[PDB]
From Swiss-Prot, chains A, B:
It comes from the Viruses. This is Uncharacterized protein ORF102. Coiled coil: none annotated.
Length: 114, 114
């Protein structure tokens, strides 16, 4: 019931398939990265959309208190927005065990740690 | 009188001095990067501050129409805010002639093109 928790469980399998995979990095185009990450939380009834460099979240069921706790700007329990970079940092938190995460408006780059 | 124009004129000299400079990359900690970039526009009376993952701009003199044109959310001609990533992309536009620009909450990395 915390939608951000769904990221600790979803593999980087998503990002592997969608990205360009090298020995020591994976590069994922931004729209494909965001599409995959948005789809993860769609199962708790949380809808996500990008407009500009902001991510907008809204939910019919689940409260978004976890997103607010992590920095999102919410108008109520069911509607929040947050910068693209904050969204990327949140959803890749578990991937940081194995990868440096960096990005720009074009793409997300995960570099194997070492 | 367009404050974003001041970036086309300010060298990467700033970033070299503040960063860790290697043969094919420069890595600049975020607070030092933003401090240098904020200082650039301070000369047209534009004040800049980071809070969360947002950059807040306000000006006593110069209008901020150029920032608005580039995506900033403005309450009037003299007050705007924009996501950190959008700010980074804007201020490094001229550096993109020589460098890939990428970043995260920790630091900005410029990789020599080639
Ligand atoms: Cl954990
Ligand atoms: Cl857009
Ligand atoms: Cl130009
Ligand atoms: Cl802060």
């Amino acid at each position: 019931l915390e939608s951000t928790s769904l990221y600790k469980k979803a593999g980087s399998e998503n990002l592997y398939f969608q990205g360009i995979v090298d020995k020591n990095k994976i590069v994922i185009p931004m729209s494909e990265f965001l599409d995959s990450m948005f789809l993860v939380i769609e199962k708790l009834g949380v809808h996500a959309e990008k407009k500009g460099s902001m991510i907008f979240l809204s939910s019919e069921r689940v409260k978004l208190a976890d997103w607010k706790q992590l920095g999102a700007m919410c108008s109520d329990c069911y509607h929040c927005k947050l910068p693209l970079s904050s969204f990327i940092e949140i959803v890749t938190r578990k991937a940081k065990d194995k990868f440096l995460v960096m990005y720009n408006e074009k793409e997300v780059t995960l570099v194997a740690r070492g």
